[PDB]
Amino acid sequence: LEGESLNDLLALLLSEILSATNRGNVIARSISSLQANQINWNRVFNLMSTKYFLMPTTASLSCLFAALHDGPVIDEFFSCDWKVIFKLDLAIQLHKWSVQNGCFDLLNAEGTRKVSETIPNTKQSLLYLLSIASLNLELFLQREELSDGPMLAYFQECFFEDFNYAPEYLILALVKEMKRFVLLIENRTVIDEILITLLIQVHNKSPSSFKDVISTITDDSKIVDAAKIIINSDDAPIANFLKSLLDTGRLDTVINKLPFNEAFKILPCARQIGWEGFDTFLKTKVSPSNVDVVLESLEVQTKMTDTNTPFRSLKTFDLFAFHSLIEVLNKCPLDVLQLQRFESLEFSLLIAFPRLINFGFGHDEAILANGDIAGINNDIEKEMQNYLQKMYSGELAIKDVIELLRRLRDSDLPRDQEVFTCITHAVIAESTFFQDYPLDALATTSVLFGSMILFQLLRGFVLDVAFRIIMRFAKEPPESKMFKFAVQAIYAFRIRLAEYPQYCKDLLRDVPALKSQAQVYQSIVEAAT
C-alpha cells in the first residue's frame, strides 16, 4: 500500500496513542518495517491533527517513538503543530521518561537536532534534543495565555526541575531558536528577561558550561545585565566568571558598561585574571562625582588583613594599581573633606602596603620580586630592627643609616629594595608613638626622619605624607615631644627648605610657636623667595 491511501497509518499511530500493549508493539514494529524517508510524514502528522481521535502516557508515546524510530521523523513529529493540551501532555510525559523501565531511547535516536553541535550531552537530558527543549520553552513562554489546569501547574514543576538540572540546554535552545520565540511571544523583552534569568542560572548551577553559553550570545546588553546581578547577589569569589568573560573577550565591555562602583568592586580580581584595561578605566571613568566610592573601597582594602578576609589577593589591588590610583586621586579636583579623607588614606595605604614607598622610581621589578601585599618576612623585620636599635644605642651614626638607605633606594636587588621598604615603613608607622619617646630616642628619630626628607629617601606621595606628619606635629603645643620632633626634623632638612616655599608659608601661617625656635624659624622665613 502506497501514497495518500498509505498515509492512513496516521490512524495506526492515532490508535497507538488511544488506549494497546499486546498488539501495540507489533503495530510499532510493523510501521518501523518501512523505509521512513520514502514516507511523507508531514501528511501523516497533519492528518492526526486534523481528524483528531476515534492524552498519551509515557508507554503510548514510547510506542509512537518506537514506531517512528528515526530521529528526523521524530523531530518531524515534534514540529507538527499540535493542540496546546497535547503539547503540555507530551512535555510532561517526557519529563517522566525512563529507558530503564523500557521507554524508547530518544537520546540514542540518530539524526535528531541538538541544542549544541559542540557540547556533548553529559547531563543525559532529553532537553539536549532541540525539539524537546524548544517544546518546553514554547509552553513556558506562553504560561499566562494558557488555561490553568492541573497540567499547567504540573508542567511548571517539570520546567522548574529542568531549569535546575540542565539550564545550559534550555538557554542554548532559546538562543539557537530565538527568531521563533521572539515571533511567538511578539515581545522581545520577555525573551530578554527569560534569557537573563537563564544566564544567571547557568552561572549558579553548572558553571562549567558558562563560557560555552556566553560564546553563542551576541548582544552584550544581556551579559552585562546578568553580570550586574551576579555581582551583587553572590558573595565572593567571582573569578572563573570573570575569566570566562575575558576568555570570550566580553570582560572589558562588562567592566566599562557595568554601573560604576560595581565595576570597581571587581577591578582587583579582573586584573589578577589578566584584564589590563585598568588605566584607561581610571582616566575615563573616575570623576569627582564618583570618588567617594574609590576612597571607601581603598580604605576597606587597607583595613583588610590576611586573617580578617577570605581571599584578599582578589579583593586587593596590586602595587601598580594602588600607585596609579594614588596618582589619579591627587590629580582629581577633590573637595576639602575628600582631600582630608584622601591624605588620611595615603597614610593608611602606606601603612598597609609598605612596598608602595619606593614604587614608581624605576625599581619596581625589584620591589615586586618580594610580593605585592604579602607582608615582609620576619628575618628582614629582625635585621632592620637590629640596624635601627644599633643606631639608637649610639653605635651607628644617623648619616650611616641615611647612606645605606640612599644606596638601597636605587638598587635593583629585590632584597635591598625590601630592606629599604622595611626600614622606612618602620620609622613612619612608628610615628604614632613618638609622643611617648624619651628625648634622646626622639631626637635621634627626628634627625633620621628629617634627613630622610633631606636626602630624598621619601618621594612622591610618601613625601607629602612625611610633610603632613611634620606639620601635624608642628601644630601640637610647644615644649611637647611632638612639637620638638617637628622642629628638629625641619631643622634636619633645612638646607633643602628652599624647595618648598608654599610649605614654609603654611608653617609660618599655622604654627606661631615657631617664632620661639630661633635657628629653624630663621631658616623657614628665609623661604620667602
Closest alpha carbon to 139 in 185, 76, 196: 185
Residue 235 beta carbon to its own copies: minimum distance, rounded to whole angstroms: 7
Instruction: Report the partner that residue 332 touches, choosing among its own copies, Au ion, none (CB closer than 5 to 8 A by kind).
Output: Au ion
Kindly give the residue spans of alpha helices, DSSP state H, lying in 304-409.
319-331, 336-352, 364-368, 378-392, 398-408
Residues 34, 151, 229, 441: which binds its own copies (CB under 8 A)?
Answer: 441
Residue 335 beta carbon to its own copies: minimum distance, rounded to whole angstroms: 31
Residues 112, 125, 244, 444: which binds Au ion (CB under 5 A)?
Answer: 244
118 binds its own copies per the rule CB under 8 A: no
Give dist(CA 470, CA 473) in Å, integer.
Answer: 5
Helix (H, G, I), strand (E, B) or coil at 172: helix
Query: CB-wise, 12 or 304, nearer to its own copies?
Result: 304
103 binds Au ion per the rule CB under 5 A: yes
Query: 340 to 379, contacts with its own copies by CB under 8 A?
Result: none
Instruction: Report the partner that residue 240 touches, choosing among Au ion, its own copies, none (CB closer than 5 to 8 A by kind).
Output: Au ion
Amino acid at site 509: R
124 binds its own copies per the rule CB under 8 A: yes
Cell 630592627: give the residue: 385
DSSP state of 168: H
Instruction: Report the partner that residue 207 touches, choosing among Au ion, its own copies, none (CB closer than 5 to 8 A by kind).
Output: Au ion
Give dist(CA 179, CA 183) in Å, integer.
Answer: 6
Residue 150 beta carbon to Au ion: minimum distance, rounded to whole angstroms: 20
Cell 551579559: give the residue: 223
Residue 75 beta carbon to Au ion: minimum distance, rounded to whole angstroms: 19
For residues 114 and 167, the answer to whether their CB atoms sit within 8 Å is no
Query: 296 to 335, contacts with its own copies by CB under 8 A?
Result: 305-312, 314-315
Closest alpha carbon to 143 in 94, 105, 204, 187: 187
Stretch that binds Au ion, among 25-33, 34-42, 82-90, 182-190 (CB under 5 A): 25-33
Contacts with Au ion, 505-524, as mask; x by CB under 5 A: --------------------
Residues 33, 38, 502, 529: which binds Au ion (CB under 5 A)?
Answer: 33
Specify the length of the chain in residues.
529
What grid cell was written down for 221? 546588553
Residue 447 beta carbon to Au ion: minimum distance, rounded to whole angstroms: 10
For residues 68 and 37, the answer to whether their CB atoms sit within 8 Å is no
Give dist(CA 256, CA 482) in Å, integer.
Answer: 47
Instruction: Report the partner that residue 155 touches, choosing among its own copies, Au ion, none (CB closer than 5 to 8 A by kind).
Output: none
395 binds its own copies per the rule CB under 8 A: no
Query: 399 to 438, contacts with its own copies by CB under 8 A?
Result: 433, 435-438
Question: Rounded to a whole number, what is the distance in angstroms from the first to the last CA of the chain?
Answer: 114
Stretch that binds its own copies, among 12-20, 27-35, 229-237, 411-419 (CB under 8 A): 229-237
Closest alpha carbon to 417 in 380, 454, 453: 380
Residues 443, 508, 513, 525: which binds its own copies (CB under 8 A)?
Answer: 443
Residues 33, 38, 98, 529: which binds its own copies (CB under 8 A)?
Answer: 98
- How wide is the angle at C-alpha 493 spanned by C-alphas 487 and 495, nearest 5°? 120
Bridge partners of 114, per DSSP, are 129
Query: CB-wise, 45 or 97, nearer to its own copies?
Result: 97
Q: Is the peptide bond before 288 cis (omega within 30 degrees of 0)?
A: no
DSSP state of 493: T
Applying CB under 8 A, the site for its own copies has a residue count of 42
Give dist(CA 115, CA 329) in Å, integer.
Answer: 50
102 binds its own copies per the rule CB under 8 A: no
Half-sphere exposure for 499 (CA within 13 Å, toward CB): 11
> Given phi > 0 = left and psi -120 to 50 = alpha, else beta, which region is 120?
beta
272 binds Au ion per the rule CB under 5 A: yes
Stretch that binds Au ion, among 34-42, 224-232, 250-258, 419-427 (CB under 5 A): 419-427
434 binds Au ion per the rule CB under 5 A: no
Query: 111 to 150, contacts with Au ion by CB under 5 A?
Result: none
Residue 440 beta carbon to its own copies: minimum distance, rounded to whole angstroms: 5
Closest alpha carbon to 424 in 444, 404, 398, 405: 405
Instruction: Report the partner that residue 436 touches, choosing among its own copies, Au ion, none (CB closer than 5 to 8 A by kind).
Output: its own copies
Helix (H, G, I), strand (E, B) or coil at 148: coil
Q: Where are the beta strands (DSSP E) in 226-337?
A: none
Residue 133 beta carbon to its own copies: minimum distance, rounded to whole angstroms: 13
Give dist(CA 228, CA 255) in Å, integer.
Answer: 10
Residue 389 beta carbon to its own copies: minimum distance, rounded to whole angstroms: 5
Residue nearest to Au ion (CB): 25
CB atoms within 10 A of CB 503: 18
Closest alpha carbon to 408 in 474, 340, 361: 361
Residue 182 beta carbon to its own copies: minimum distance, rounded to whole angstroms: 28
Stretch that binds its own copies, among 118-126, 141-149, 344-352, 468-476 (CB under 8 A): 118-126
Site residues for its own copies per CB under 8 A:
95-101, 122-126, 161-162, 164-165, 205, 235-237, 305-312, 314-315, 389, 392-393, 433, 435-441, 443
Site residues for Au ion per CB under 5 A:
24-25, 30, 33, 59-60, 62-63, 66, 101-104, 163, 175, 207, 210, 217, 219, 236, 239-241, 244, 269, 272-273, 287-288, 314, 332-333, 347, 352, 399, 403, 422, 425-426, 439, 442-443, 468, 484
